[PDB]
Symmetry: C2
Subunit: 165 residues, 2 copies
């Protein structure tokens, strides 16, 4: 049946992150709600199991985004720039903190289209659920607001966003 | 001159974290006191990266080809190692939060020698500076978390890490 099993909590922003990626990659999965988590089991890789959402996401793109539709290649400088943003997102998902995170984002996005290169990647996507909590916005962080809005309009993400309610 | 420039704050745990890896890999570097930390690789057209665990990933993937202290990119173990690096960055951004983190560590290290089955990696190294502060909470560390305390202690005894710890001491 389904290639992956995703263990998550019901409204879990992290589970949502991972789901956005699964959908972007056209991968089949089953979601199981509990109540670390989230966790991913890959039935085509000996039921290899990984947790930490951004690690899960790295695994999905490196192994299953060979077309680089939403990710850069392993072993390139760009990969470590992608990784740096994925760490920034994870550190920032855990006020002035929100504004500081947004400030960094704006400082980059006002100058280039996406967090790495001029391609939407999982670096950008990783902020969506958190950012759809962090909300006047378009006034103080216009580049970020616009980028966020445009990410939401990608068909896979719009579908996930529907399921999200 | 020095292959890397590391920007960091004077007593910074994240800096020490990165320095551990630079030394384990025998790479030349200069430290400048002031995200931060940030690393500049003069042998890679001054490619520049920040976030200590992204920096560290960069350092092992490119410069630990012998796999002395890391696993190969592409393998499942790589993603497990990555898992622990994210857990290190997150879990340690009352202080039962500390005991929660140590709890997770203990549940693993009581059943296996290191975080990634078999050998010490940067996954293990990543916790060292944070763990040093946490063990300044009396002896609840070695009492509640003996596997973790053993593991931590033995990591500190690695020559390179001992050297970095002398530097960290005098700094």
């Amino acid at each position: 049946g389904k290639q992956f099993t995703l263990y998550t909590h019901k409204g879990g922003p992290n589970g949502w992150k991972v789901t956005i990626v699964l959908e972007e990659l056209g991968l089949t999965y089953e979601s199981i709600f509990l109540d670390r988590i989230p966790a991913l089991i890959d039935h085509k890789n000996n039921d290899y199991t990984v947790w930490e959402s951004n690690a899960i996401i790295q695994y999905l793109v490196d192994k299953y985004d060979k077309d680089r539709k939403v990710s850069v290649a392993p072993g390139t400088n760009e990969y470590y720039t992608q990784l740096q943003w994925l760490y920034f997102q994870a550190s920032g998902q855990g006020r002035n903190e929100i504004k500081r995170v947004l400030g960094v984002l704006e400082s980059v996005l006002s100058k280039q289209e996406f967090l790495v290169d001029g391609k939407a990647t999982v670096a950008d996507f990783s902020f969506l659920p958190w950012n759809e909590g962090a909300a006047q916005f378009e006034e103080e962080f216009p580049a970020t607001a616009k980028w966020h809005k445009k990410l939401l309009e990608r068909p896979a993400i719009a579908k996930v966003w529907e399921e999200r309610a």
